[PDB]
Design a protein around this motif. Structure first.
Motif, short mmCIF file in Angstrom:
data_model
loop_
_atom_site.label_atom_id
_atom_site.label_comp_id
_atom_site.label_asym_id
_atom_site.label_seq_id
_atom_site.Cartn_x
_atom_site.Cartn_y
_atom_site.Cartn_z
N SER A 35 0.81 -1.23 0.00
CA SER A 35 0.00 0.00 0.00
C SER A 35 0.85 1.29 0.00
O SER A 35 1.83 1.42 0.77
N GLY A 36 0.45 2.24 -0.83
CA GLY A 36 1.17 3.50 -0.89
C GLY A 36 2.52 3.52 -1.58
O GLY A 36 3.26 4.47 -1.45
N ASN A 73 -6.93 13.46 -7.81
CA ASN A 73 -5.65 13.09 -7.34
C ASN A 73 -4.57 13.44 -8.31
O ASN A 73 -3.46 13.85 -7.90
N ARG A 203 11.76 5.90 5.28
CA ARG A 203 11.22 5.03 4.28
C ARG A 203 11.96 5.29 3.00
O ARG A 203 12.21 6.40 2.64
N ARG A 205 11.86 4.22 -1.08
CA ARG A 205 11.14 3.58 -2.16
C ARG A 205 12.13 3.12 -3.21
O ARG A 205 13.11 3.82 -3.50
#
Ligand SMILES: Nc1ncnc2c1ncn2[C@@H]1O[C@H](COP(=O)(O)OP(=O)(O)OP(=O)(O)O)[C@@H](O)[C@H]1O
Ligand SMILES: Nc1ncnc2c1ncn2[C@@H]1O[C@H](COP(=O)(O)OP(=O)(O)OP(=O)(O)O)[C@@H](O)[C@H]1O
Ligand SMILES: Nc1ncnc2c1ncn2[C@@H]1O[C@H](COP(=O)(O)OP(=O)(O)OP(=O)(O)O)[C@@H](O)[C@H]1O
Ligand SMILES: [Mg+2]
Ligand SMILES: [Mg+2]
Lengths: 506, 148, 74, 59
Positions: A35-36, A73, A203, A205
């Protein structure tokens, strides 16, 4: 291009290098992650870039988000999908269930869907298709084998239609199975994994192309960032060792040093200044930045240890007015705690700012500060990134390193960047007679001759004054030498008695 | 407050991880800094004498002024020394001054000019003919100036 | 995640007090601290001399040494 | 001198003044006897001294 498979460009920054050209045409690429992680963004960007750069219409199939939401979005990245839906370049095909529904419908719908999508493709003359979260559809009540068949059916029909597709999937574990049912991995032609790894409360990515049936590609994980411009990937291993190299020189902002460096630094070079805390690496940086202004050139000082205020108070106390450099629009100061981001972010902020300001000189005060926390391999990767950018961009760069131990330091750097660097300026404390003096040394220089002396130097308001070497000393590097004398008193101007004047006259 | 002092950041680092600790330091450090509060922080190095790094936790960087205290073994005795290691906007003295402690508090005396390897905790005392040259018995070139 | 906008990433420590949730975005603090040339005394005059006229009011001072050296005195 | 002697030191004391000498000491049946410091030695602390035996000012 010697690759057996025709690819289509995504125009997503860095992706086409990683994928050796873009997504194979006529095939589907599974893009999965937790998720995300950026799945939806990737697939949108794929259709979007497709429309805006190639006038390739796109069909977007959504199973959970709402067409208004997908449009709402996308404004985050400044993309007006509504306008494209309007011009008929983009068609969002709403396949999301009703917030007021029943139960049962995932396969004849899988036929209803096939037939549907073929209509949209045919009607809009589409070339790109993104199916967002196919996962959620059999998340109605299914088991692995049922999923494998249904997926295969869809992918297959799509390939017949001739469409290049991006299918998105969810995963629950950052390093576990590729996708939920541990079946999508093998049913797709290409697989891309988006990860958002934790590790120490920060975090990171990463994007990985795991497979592309038919062609080669870059292997492994690549760090990327989601910004106001969407996904941004840095193929740090795709960077080539073909940087231009000149013999041109530039000043360090310290004349004596310039001599020591056999005529100043090379324009095309990465310089490193290391020494214990307090030795003055920051002073040299100040003086190197100021010098590019006094020559009406642009420079950026990325500071990771001092406030913009402090940097100024201190600079002014060393002469040099940073205030003016700012106004004159010759000098740009950045400032940021290494903790206010992950290396990837930092690296991009630096690049970003180098593009908006086109500096000729750049100074990172304390790489060693950016190394706080991070793993050495992640750090080295960051250094090669900023170093190499600078190099291929003809931008002279001065990087700082504070060594963890004052006096007796046995290696230039604790992180072993030595080698990644062209010129090494070394600063150190020398205990001479119950006192802490400093010494400066041009440890190495790649294309020049440079002085081999370990000169002592003082710091005043005027700045750095580079004096003479400690000739009558042994164990200099040790930090606390031993004084030995074949002489000292030997000439230089003995001639005793009344050699001076005092303030009155001379 | 106008001033704040934390007696022993090094005692707060007990247990915790270095990265959690560094985060705490930046925390109380920058708060003080943006608040115009002068702050004095304490750090007890894990080894007396021979300490090779200012701080074991590597905070030295995130600091403006460093005051360093160290034992110096002088003649079978344990004496102290104080040194202003670095000061960002100023000039500060570069001497490693000896100092005593009494009821009156701290008395900062002189530097150990006639020693080598002080930083280490065990100097090497070393006059063996002080700066007046082996010509203390000034040769006798001066056997003329005076006569009858 | 927050579909549609940005946000700080990662973990941020917080405390539940009598005033509810209190979160410190230690990575959100900016490197924009005010910096003056104003001095202040240490409580030790000679020290003040060595420091070129006292500690800066705007500054972080660190006193290191072995146990017993006298940090606590300073 | 090829022997293992002892020494005692009051390394620190919070409220008092204590002696800063590293005093040699022996152990007998009577208990601990605290003698003098090793004034004419270097690197005591290290355990392996070096007696200075300075040729004074040597006049
Ligand atoms: N302008 C922006 N700048 C930086 N980050 C942004 C911006 N807009 C969105 N993001 C980030 O991108 C993420 C969007 O993820 P996205 O919508 O692409 O799909 P997903 O995470 O793959 O799947 P899911 O539908 O489960 O959320 C947000 O979590 C957010 O952190
Ligand atoms: N006006 C001044 N006059 C005399 N010396 C000063 C002056 N300003 C600073 N200095 C000296 O220079 C030192 C500052 O070091 P500098 O800012 O150059 O960076 P550094 O040693 O490389 O890194 P860091 O400060 O993070 O430890 C002080 O410790 C001090 O001895
Ligand atoms: N009244 C006094 N007279 C002379 N010396 C004293 C007196 N009080 C304390 N001392 C000396 O000063 C030392 C005390 O050190 P201080 O309390 O300043 O903190 P510290 O050395 O920084 O840290 P810590 O006490 O935890 O080791 C003692 O070890 C002792 O030698
Ligand atoms: Mg600095
Ligand atoms: Mg104490």
């Amino acid at each position: 291009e010697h690759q057996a498979i025709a690819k289509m460009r995504t125009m997503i920054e860095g992706f086409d290098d990683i994928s050796h050209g873009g997504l194979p045409i006529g095939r589907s690429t599974l893009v999965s992650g937790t998720s995300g992680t950026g799945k939806t963004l990737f697939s949108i960007q794929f259709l979007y870039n497709g429309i805006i750069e190639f006038d390739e219409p796109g069909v977007f199939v959504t199973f959970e988000e709402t067409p208004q939401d997908i449009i709402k979005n996308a404004r985050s990245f400044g993309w007006d999908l509504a306008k494209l839906v309007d011009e008929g370049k983009l068609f969002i095909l709403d396949a999301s269930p009703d917030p007021e529904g029943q139960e049962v419908v995932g396969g004849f719908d899988l036929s209803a869907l096939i037939e549907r999508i073929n209509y949209a493709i045919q009607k809009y003359r589409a070339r790109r298709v993104s199916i967002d979260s196919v996962t959620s559809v059999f998340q109605q009540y299914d088991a692995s084998s049922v999923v494998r068949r249904e997926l295969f059916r869809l992918v297959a029909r799509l390939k017949q239609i001739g469409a290049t597709t991006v299918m998105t999937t969810e995963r629950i574990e950052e390093y576990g199975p590729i996708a939920r049912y541990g079946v999508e991995e093998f049913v797709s032609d290409n697989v891309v994994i988006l990860r958002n790894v934790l590790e120490g409360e920060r975090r990171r990515r990463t994007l990985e192309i795991l497979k592309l049936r038919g062609t080669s590609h870059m292997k492994g994980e690549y760090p990327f960032t989601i910004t106001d411009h969407g996904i941004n990937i840095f193929p740090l291993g795709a960077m080539r060792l073909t940087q231009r190299s000149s013999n041109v020189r530039v000043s360090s902002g310290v004349v004596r040093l310039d001599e020591m460096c056999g005529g100043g630094f090379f324009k095309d070079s990465i310089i490193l200044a290391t020494g214990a805390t307090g030795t003055g690496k920051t002073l040299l940086v100040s003086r190197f930045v100021e010098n590019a202004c006094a020559n009406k050139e642009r420079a950026i000082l990325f500071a990771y240890e001092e406030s913009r205020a402090q940097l100024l108070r201190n600079a002014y106390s060393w002469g040099m007015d940073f205030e003016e450099m700012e106004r004159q629009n010759l000098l740009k100061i950045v400032c940021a705690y290494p903790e206010s981001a992950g290396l990837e972010d930092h690296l991009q902020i630096i690049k970003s700012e180098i593009n908006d300001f086109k500096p000729a000189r750049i100074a990172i005060d304390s790489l060693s500060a950016l190394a706080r926390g991070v793993s050495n391999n992640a750090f080295r990767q960051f250094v090669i990134g900023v170093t190499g950018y600078a190099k291929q961009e003809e931008i002279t760069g001065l990087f700082t390193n504070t060594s963890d131990q004052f006096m007796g330091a046995h290696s230039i750097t604790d992180s072993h960047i030595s080698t990644i660097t062209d010129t090494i300026i070394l600063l150190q404390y020398v205990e001479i007679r119950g006192e802490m003096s400093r010494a400066i040394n041009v440890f190495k220089m790649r294309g020049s001759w440079h002085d081999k002396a370990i000169r002592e130097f003082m710091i005043s308001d005027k700045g750095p004054d580079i004096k003479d070497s400690f000739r009558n000393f042994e164990r200099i590097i040790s930090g606390s030498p031993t004084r030995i004398t074949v002489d000292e008193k030997s000439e230089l101007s003995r001639i005793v008695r009344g050699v001076q004047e005092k303030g009155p006259e001379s």
